[PDB]
Design a protein around this ligand. Structure first.
Ligand code: BEI
Lengths: 99, 99
């Protein structure tokens, strides 16, 4: 589809059998979701944005469905105020910026 | 043009007669640039991101050229890690997300 930017580009995602709302973020290198449980082993990681850094847990090879499109990649979980779909996953669904 | 996201969507912008590099960020409501000198009076604003909030100076009706497209709008200046072109200006140049 074609998403305009008059409003925040929020979409529905499916992860771990759960439905959630997330922001398509071209400014994010990584994908980070609010605190939740995921299977497998995780590694600690510090990610920084506007405001500073936060500590998150890194899970690899996680399957996520974005607007019906399946994608696989690293998903970080932590105290983020909003679920963010970053470039590592946006590329897998063929997302591009156009103007 | 069409910009893929395998790399950060960095573009060249022109403001105050100077060239700078900035990130096309669909996850940002506002446009924030690194510390610099702009004309006129400014108003205060607090903006929040991943690691918390930062204080910035708000300037209105600022001329900024993005990839050759001229836009005139609100620009924030503060301790941001990178120059960010947010939705307020992305809509002015007709930018959309597609997949
Ligand atoms: C998952 C974050 C990721 C690890 C990080 N990227 C960023 O922080 C991006 O910023 C560019 C950036 C790029 C590189 C280093 C630092 C900063 C991002 O798109 C922000 O812009 C945007 O974050 C999503 C968000 C939306 C609403 C509320 C809170 C957060 C955000 O903070 N939006 C604010 C917002 O819209 N708040 C409502 C806005 C005012 C900031 C200009 C990164 O890639 N680090 C290397």
């Amino acid at each position: 589809p074609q998403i305009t930017l008059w409003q925040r580009p929020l979409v529905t995602i499916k992860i771990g059998g759960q439905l959630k709302e997330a922001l398509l973020d071209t400014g994010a290198d990584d994908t980070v979701l609010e605190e939740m449980s995921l299977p497998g082993r995780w590694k600690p990681k510090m990610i920084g944005g506007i405001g500073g850094f936060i500590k998150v847990r890194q899970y690899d090879q996680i399957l996520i469905e974005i607007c019906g499109h399946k994608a696989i990649g690293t998903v970080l979980v932590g105290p983020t105020p909003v679920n963010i779909i970053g470039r590592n996953l946006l590329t897998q669904i063929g997302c591009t910026l156009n103007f």
